[PDB]
């Protein structure tokens, strides 16, 4: 029976590939040949938020576009007031090895996780006046790569155990589990409508999930290496990826195939972070070579550089308002670019 | 008023400085090794789904943090980039067991890692007493698994433990030679390997780690001060 099922699998794969080939009657580069360039995007370090004792591994902006939570490997979360550099909170973590952090859309909670295989929800607004752990979500059999809030009640996380799960924070147990990746799930991005989310895995593929149906809708296999970062395009119909291949790819969910590749032969290091601009015309990307590059999402030609970091740029994000870009690095400093 | 928020930020900064004064005084060690080894016994003997396991011990009034990565997947390509900038990696192998080739491959993978090219390795060839018993019994020949042993001869620069069977010395030094050859043939200067023979009953592992870490930070400072 195994041989027959493998035959059927290869038949379906060939059919899918042929359909994608048939739908490729044009290219985004060909279509975008007429639009005017964006010129050169020069940005300068408006702020330098320092105080983390070790490598900064993750950061996330609040929906107010002013407060941002930052996580470091020494076991601290610091909620910064970016407008003034003030530190609102400094939360000591139980586990020093934190690899992700999130800021709830309402701003009431933050989450973090890492090699301890547990996602800890912290309650920022409490009568006692101090940040207190509200829930410790356990059940993953591997380190935690990413975590994003659908709401104050629900959080979706991805772990190195090749699984992604959706949690109900109130009861504290997995509502549903997503499976199918054959490697560590390294990044996770939530659709703007919060009905779908895409996760990249070390198996060099990205999958589109349905948070309520619990099944993958389609899979994308354009990369040749591990996918370290992923972000949705603002319209929600496309998403970009970053990999150890030292290149980015832009996939569209409706076309179900890659649209554009961003790479220069003079770049040889992997990509750690990715995020679009508010309009989506720019595609910032963090690199292991200590600097971040700005890519024109349509022309696909490099349009700038953000070089102010001493070490690896491990994290990066754009305000929902779109006024600024934050970039954390292993230098332990976090900088706001504008 | 915003001045109160500034004062709160200053208080948080003072707390962060008081925490940095503890962060910089602690030496962080990563404990690696296959399940057949005795790394669990080693960590237990440190008498001063959860994932990371941490053990703290003190020797000569310097604090050590020993992290054992218990519950993860078999592959470590990604989560090991976090353990960059640790003082040292404590690699443990069951020298009496042969699984030794898988241990050799694992040590080769750790040594030749992009993110661990400045991290010195402290190698504990654990369960040496079992190897000595195995050699004394002579039930199985190490040569079958490793053909090189048929022509290997113990060196003159050896430091044999008093009261040791010569064949045991040859076997243990050959096994040490495997790992030191792997280390020397692939990297130099940036990081070093410190082989050690040990047994679960031993109580000197803390002293071994302390001495090796002392030398490691000596070399780090020597590089920092442009003396090498």
């Amino acid at each position, epitope marked *: 029976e195994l041989d027959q099922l493998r035959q059927e699998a290869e038949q379906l794969k060939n059919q899918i590939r042929d359909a994608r080939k048939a739908c490729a009657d044009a290219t985004l580069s060909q279509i975008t040949n007429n639009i005017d360039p964006v010129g050169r995007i020069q940005m300068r370090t408006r702020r330098t938020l320092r105080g983390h004792l070790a490598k900064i591994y993750a950061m996330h902006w609040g929906t107010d576009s002013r407060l941002l939570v930052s996580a470091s490997q020494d076991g601290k979360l610091i909620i910064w*007031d970016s407008y003034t550099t003030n530190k609102v909170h400094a939360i000591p973590l139980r586990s020093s090895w934190v690899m992700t952090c999130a800021y709830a859309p309402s*701003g009431n909670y933050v989450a973090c996780g890492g090699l301890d295989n547990i996602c800890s929800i912290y309650n920022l607004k409490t009568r006692e006046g101090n940040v207190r752990v509200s829930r410790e979500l356990a059940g993953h059999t591997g380190y935690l790569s990413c975590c994003r809030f659908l709401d104050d009640n629900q959080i979706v996380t991805s772990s190195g155990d090749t699984t992604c799960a959706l949690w109900d924070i109130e009861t504290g147990q997995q509502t549903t589990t997503f499976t199918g990746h054959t490697g560590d799930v390294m990044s996770l991005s939530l659709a703007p409508d919060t009905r779908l989310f895409v996760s990249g895995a070390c198996d060099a593929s990205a999958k589109l999930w349905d948070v309520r149906e619990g099944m993958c809708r389609q899979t994308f296999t354009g990369h040749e290496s591990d996918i370290n970062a992923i972000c949705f395009f603002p319209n929600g119909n496309a998403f970009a990826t970053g990999s150890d291949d030292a290149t980015c790819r832009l996939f569209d969910l409706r076309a179900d195939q890659e649209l554009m590749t961003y790479s220069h032969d003079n770049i040889i290091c992997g990509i750690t972070s990715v995020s679009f601009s508010k309009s989506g015309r720019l595609l910032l990307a963090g690199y292991d070579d200590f600097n971040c590059n700005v890519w024109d999402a349509l022309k696909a030609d490099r349009a700038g550089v953000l070089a102010g970091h001493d070490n690896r740029v491990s994290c990066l994000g754009v305000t929902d308002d779109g006024m600024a870009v934050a970039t954390g690095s292993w230098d332990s400093f976090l900088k706001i670019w504008n | 008023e*915003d001045k109160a928020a500034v004062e709160r930020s200053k208080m948080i900064e003072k707390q962060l400085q008081k925490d940095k004064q503890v962060y910089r005084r602690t030496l962080r060690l990563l404990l690696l090794g296959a399940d057949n080894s005795g790394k669990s016994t080693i960590v237990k003997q440190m008498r001063i789904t959860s994932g990371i396991f941490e053990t703290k011990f003190q020797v000569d009034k310097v604090n050590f943090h020993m992290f054992d990565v218990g519950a993860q997947r078999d592959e470590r390509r990604k989560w090991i980039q976090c353990f960059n900038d640790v003082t040292a990696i404590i690699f443990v192998v069951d020298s009496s067991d042969n699984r030794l080739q898988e241990a050799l491959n694992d040590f080769d993978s750790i040594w030749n890692n992009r993110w661990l090219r400045t991290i010195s390795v402290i190698l504990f060839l654990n369960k040496q007493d079992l190897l000595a018993e195995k050699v004394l019994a002579g039930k199985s020949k190490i040569e079958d698994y490793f053909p090189e042993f048929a022509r290997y001869t113990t060196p003159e620069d050896a430091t044999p433990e008093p009261g040791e069977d010569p064949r045991v010395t040859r076997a243990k030094y050959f096994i040490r030679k495997e790992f030191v050859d792997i280390s020397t043939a692939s990297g130099d200067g940036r990081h070093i390997c410190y082989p050690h023979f040990t047994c679960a009953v031993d109580t000197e592992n803390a002293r071994r780690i302390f001495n090796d870490c002392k030398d490691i930070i000596l070399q780090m400072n020597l590089r920092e001060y442009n003396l090498v």
Partner: single-chain antibody, 228 residues
Framework: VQLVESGGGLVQPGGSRKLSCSAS????????MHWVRQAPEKGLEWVAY????????YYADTVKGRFTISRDDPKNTLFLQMTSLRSEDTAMYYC??????????????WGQGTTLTVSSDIVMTQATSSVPVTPGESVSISCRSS???????????LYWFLQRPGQSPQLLIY???NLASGVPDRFSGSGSGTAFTLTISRLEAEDVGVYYC??????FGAGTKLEL
């Protein structure tokens, strides 16, 4: 969360007495504390303030140099020491909790208060002394300020408080638009930066009390007494 004061004994003019506050149920270390007095049958007046960590201390000119405020953070106790009590000092003294950071809601919780019986700054005015009302109808309370409380940061540092008969004041609105925790959505606030209005959409008998407006750019308004 509880703030209970102590003291309030009889004092002859020219005497001295120390009031104390015991804080429990919250992290007293990171809260700035205020002393707010209330003379018999009239409005509130701000007495003193000590920031978290005791880094900043302020007094009203009515008591500057005559009172002294101290906090014993390890024991979660706050003290107000008075050296020379005058007849003017007779008033009920509340202790008010306040934490300052972006988005916080200072002045949120007030203590129980104790009666101490003894034998230029911003001018905040509420012209209306009282307003007859009935349950189910909307009512508006207004106030004026000498300076425009709208700071260059965009925030309008105007606070509203309600004191029910026989209770300590409760925070309604902070910075002119933000409802405090536990306040029903029936209350709302607005202002132009120099004139402000507080509105209750639908009144209930539990809303009867005296409404005070305070600026934090700390003077209190004369108060408005809603009656039914």
């Amino acid at each position: 969360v509880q703030l209970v004061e102590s003291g309030g004994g009889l004092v002859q003019p020219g005497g001295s007495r120390k009031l104390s506050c015991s804080a429990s149920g919250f992290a007293f270390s990171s809260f700035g504390m205020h002393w707010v007095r209330q003379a018999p049958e009239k409005g509130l007046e701000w007495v003193a303030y000590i920031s978290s960590g005791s880094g900043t201390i302020y007094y009203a000119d009515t008591v500057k140099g005559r009172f002294t405020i101290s906090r014993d953070d390890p024991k979660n106790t706050l003290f107000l020491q008075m050296t020379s009590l005058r007849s003017e000092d007779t008033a009920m003294y509340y202790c008010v909790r306040s934490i300052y950071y972006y988005g916080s809601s200072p002045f949120d919780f007030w203590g129980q208060g104790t009666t101490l019986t003894v034998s230029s700054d911003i001018v905040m005015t509420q012209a209306t002394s009282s307003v007859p009302v009935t349950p189910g109808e909307s009512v508006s309370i207004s106030c004026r300020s000498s300076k425009s409380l709208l700071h260059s940061n965009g925030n309008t540092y105007l606070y509203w408080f309600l004191q029910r008969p026989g209770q300590s004041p409760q925070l309604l609105i902070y910075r002119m638009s933000n409802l405090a925790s536990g306040v029903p959505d029936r209350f709302s606030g607005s202002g132009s930066g120099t004139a402000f209005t507080l509105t209750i959409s639908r009144l209930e008998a539990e809303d009867v009390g005296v409404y005070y407006c305070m600026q934090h750019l700390l003077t209190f308004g004369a108060g408005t007494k809603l009656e039914l």
